[PDB]
Q: What sequence folds into this?
RNA sequence: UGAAGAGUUUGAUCAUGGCUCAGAUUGAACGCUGGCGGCAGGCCUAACACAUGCAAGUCGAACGGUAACAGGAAGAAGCUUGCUUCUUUGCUGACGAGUGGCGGACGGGUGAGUAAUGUCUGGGAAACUGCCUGAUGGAGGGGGAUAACUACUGGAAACGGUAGCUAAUACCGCAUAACGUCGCAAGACCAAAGAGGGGGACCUUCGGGCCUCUUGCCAUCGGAUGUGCCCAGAUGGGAUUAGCUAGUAGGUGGGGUAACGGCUCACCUAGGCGACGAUCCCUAGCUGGUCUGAGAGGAUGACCAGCCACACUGGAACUGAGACACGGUCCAGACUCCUACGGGAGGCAGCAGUGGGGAAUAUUGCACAAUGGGCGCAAGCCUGAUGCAGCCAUGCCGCGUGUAUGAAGAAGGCCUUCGGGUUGUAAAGUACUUUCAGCGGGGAGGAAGGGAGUAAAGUUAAUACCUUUGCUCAUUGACGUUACCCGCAGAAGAAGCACCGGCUAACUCCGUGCCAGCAGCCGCGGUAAUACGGAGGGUGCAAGCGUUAAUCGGAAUUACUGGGCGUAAAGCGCACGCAGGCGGUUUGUUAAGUCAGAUGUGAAAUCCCCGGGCUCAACCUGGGAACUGCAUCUGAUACUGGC
């Protein structure tokens, strides 16, 4: 099933941008002119502690577009290998193929990157992959499939990705549409403006 | 008789085999005397994808135990 | 080594047998409390130097009759 | 009557009468040694045993009594025949 | 492989005390609703009951034969005069039926019974077994049977009988032989079968000699696995179930049996059992496990493995290596079906389907193509085993219902003294890409193993079987319109459910009006319940979501981890005391308990911890860990126990 909820209203709702309809413009942005509170802010109640957890839980899941039970599987996989449930949980979401295609710059939104996985337009190790939940292996090569390597919207996403900083744990060539995934996401370059002291209170119990 | 045979595992489409010493009486998947290793018909990317103690096979031949043709092909799969 | 027990005669009313009581004298596995736990055996003896109240030493051996497998060795306290 | 098993039933019922007649045949020879023990007569029970061993050895040759009963038929009475012989 | 919190006694507060919620498992069931695939599960109920069909067959390399198909021949002919359908001949291959041996105790199924000396953990000593494996030995002769078949016959039928013919690896006498046994020895008993594939050289009434291989028969005892006998430890509770038994307790003897033993008959002595719960009843298969908890623990032992008991009631014996023989045999009881009235027959707790039952569980399915088991040395045959599809969200896991852009923000709605808000960048417009699907095209892997040729001083006696690292070829598909890819438009065909005042995240507005309708507590509602119905927006989850049932996690409220008895559950009114428990010090001793060292046992699967395999996960699988203990060995020697 798909959420199908709003793209930018949720970014404003928690006061924190989701890289939804906002990743490539600064002018002519269509972002509802950065909506001033009007008579709404004066009528907003305080959230409960049970609700503050849920606001975090939904935010951290929806920024990557992932399923609940898979996000919970990563909460069980972050508990092992001295990984910290508050630290490796983020790197498990960031390490999915549907986000590796995004960080290689092939799509200007996560949904435009997940499009390439879901339409079988991506390959890993030279093999076609349709699984968005795939955990990419270290020192493995990700590339755009032969039948998709001429897309001008991907050349145009790369025209913009050449102007961005890359993750330290991967590389990509804008000509070949190809990159080595060097390492699993690392706390030496991975950071997020999320409540890392609060995500530990989840699934307990 | 006491025989050296492949026990059927791996479930559907990609079977996996445990090489055992067992009695041929009654139940197909009956109790088994001893295991000597494992055999994989599928590529595993490892040079220990199949493992056998050929000296322990020679010790069970030293008990007079029977051999099955599929296990003679397994002894060939470890290049004897 | 063979199994041997010390116990006491609780009935001598039959000629070639003695009823012998043996104990466990050990802690209970979930309470730590000592439990004596007495069990009776119908022990063979055709010597008749012992009787009721005598402390006796018995050994485990082959069945001789229905439910009977233990036999007399010696009198331990020798009170008479 | 559903697995067409009928021939094994007649081969078993034929073997019933036959195996019982194998036992009857050798029991008649044993009966005649315990009758010679009643006869109180000069080596008569030893002579009754000299004709019995070849009837119990044959009845043991395919099965029937060969586990221990034949080795009883050739030893359980061998001190009693020795008396009045 | 590791540790909770929150709602709740009131006018307050603090104890003491019970109640409650977020969570989860399931052969679930019901309703709203339902896109793809794989993997698993799928009559627990009525131990009530069946019409129909299937499910277990097979070997001619044991063989009297020939119901058929090839090939030859003969012939009735057929005619087309050179061959053949015939349809007979058993010759060769081969093979329906029978003889003969094996399989059926495999394959499976039920969980009624059983708190069990059954089951689970671990030990004891005394026996029995086919294939297998080891050791030491044997291979002569005769008498005739007996299906089938042939001619007769009892009967309504099931189901057989009379008389004769016929073979063997089917039967029975005589013989022969220890490893076996009797006779202190001379001596003697008791066995049986071969079958088929190949032949160099040499000889031959060219029949056989001679060579040889694979696989069989008999002799009497070991080994493995299996089976039987004994025992210690472990298993649910209740006494408002208290008395039990006297074939019972101990013993001896006969009889039987594989060993042992009350297994069984007869007799002698006079007990035995219960307090640590016998007797009685209820519930229940047990275990590895399944699920759950940080753990102690709790619930539960389907499906899958390791054992058991059972298959309409009860008793019984026989057959085989193995059967207290589920589809074998006998007999009565019940139930039924058939009857020609004379009698007979039968077992859905194997796979389907049906009747009855029930909340409820599939096709009166496809193939034998791979795998095991069966017959067969191998070819070949059989297989609702096994492989699979059909039907069923019943569970697990991944995955589809596109991506981007598009306005003071349109048409349509909902909130709104009407400022604006919200649906909503949603739509329309445009760009842009097609996964899955549909249809057409191409089409893997599961088809190896065996077989043919080639090669090998294979072993043997170099081209019988069989073996061989290889090479070369004809071959085998239920699933299946497979997987995977290509091609073609075209975003095209693909979404619900419950809830939104507190615990409790989402927010209002309308209707209902103490009536209806909700609820776990709160209590709501007597016409502003955002608490009952609906609408707009929203929350959460999603091919599911809600509801019910059972049982767990919250639970430190059964108590060691980790409580109470003055006043908030309760110290017995008091003393005495049997049975049971505890008990100062010093020097030895034995080494049970104890501690140490070490080995065996602790199945697979499953879990945990760490990895690997198809694009992931489901699924599958390597490693590490534990199974606290139990059994046994060799030491230590303080303290307890024994002395």
A:
């Amino acid at each position: 099933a798909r959420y199908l909820g709003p793209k930018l209203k949720l970014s404003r709702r928690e006061g924190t941008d989701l890289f939804l309809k906002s990743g490539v413009r600064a002018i002519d942005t269509k972002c509802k002119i950065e909506q001033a509170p009007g008579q709404h802010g004066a009528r907003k109640p305080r959230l409960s502690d049970y609700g503050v957890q849920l606001r975090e839980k939904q935010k951290v899941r929806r920024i990557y577009g992932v399923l609940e039970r898979q996000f919970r599987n990563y909460y069980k996989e972050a508990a092992r290998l001295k990984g910290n449930t508050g630290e490796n949980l983020l790197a498990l979401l960031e390490g999915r193929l549907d986000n590796v295609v995004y960080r290689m710059g092939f799509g200007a939104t996560r949904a435009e990157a997940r499009q390439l996985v879901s339409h079988k337009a991506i390959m890993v190790n030279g093999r076609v992959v349709n699984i968005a939940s795939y955990q990419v292996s270290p020192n493995d090569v990700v590339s755009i499939r032969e039948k998709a390597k001429k897309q001008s919207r991907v050349k145009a996403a790369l025209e913009l990705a050449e102007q961005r900083e890359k993750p330290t744990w991967l590389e990509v060539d804008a000509g070949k549409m190809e990159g080595t995934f060097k390492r699993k996401p690392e706390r030496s370059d991975l950071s997020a403006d999320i409540n890392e002291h609060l995500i530990v209170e989840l699934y307990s119990k | 008789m006491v025989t050296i045979r492949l026990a059927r595992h791996g479930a559907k489409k990609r079977p996996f085999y445990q090489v055992v010493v067992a009695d041929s009486r009654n139940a197909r998947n009956g109790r088994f005397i001893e295991r000597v290793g494992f055999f994989n018909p599928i590529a595993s990317e490892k040079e220990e994808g199949t493992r056998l103690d050929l000296d322990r096979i020679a010790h069970w031949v030293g008990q007079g135990a029977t051999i099955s043709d599929r296990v003679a092909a397994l002894i060939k799969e470890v290049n004897k | 080594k063979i199994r041997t027990l010390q116990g006491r005669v609780v009935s001598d009313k039959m000629e070639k047998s003695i009823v012998v009581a043996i104990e466990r004298f050990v802690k209970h596995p979930i309470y730590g409390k000592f439990i004596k736990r007495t069990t009776k055996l119908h022990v063979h003896d055709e010597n008749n130097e012992c009787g009721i109240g005598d402390v006796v030493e018995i050994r485990e051996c082959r069945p001789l009759s229905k439910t009977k497998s233990w036999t007399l060795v010696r009198v331990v306290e020798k009170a008479v | 009557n559903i697995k067409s098993a009928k021939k094994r039933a007649i081969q078993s019922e034929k073997a019933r009468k036959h195996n019982a007649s194998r036992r009857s045949m050798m029991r008649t020879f044993i009966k005649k040694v315990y009758a010679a023990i009643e006869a109180g007569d000069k080596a008569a029970a030893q002579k009754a045993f000299n004709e019995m061993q070849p009837i119990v050895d044959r009845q043991a040759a395919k099965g029937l009594i060969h586990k221990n009963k034949a080795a009883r038929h050739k030893a359980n009475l061998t001190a009693q025949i020795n008396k009045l012989a």
Residues 69-77 of chain B form the longest helix (9 residues).
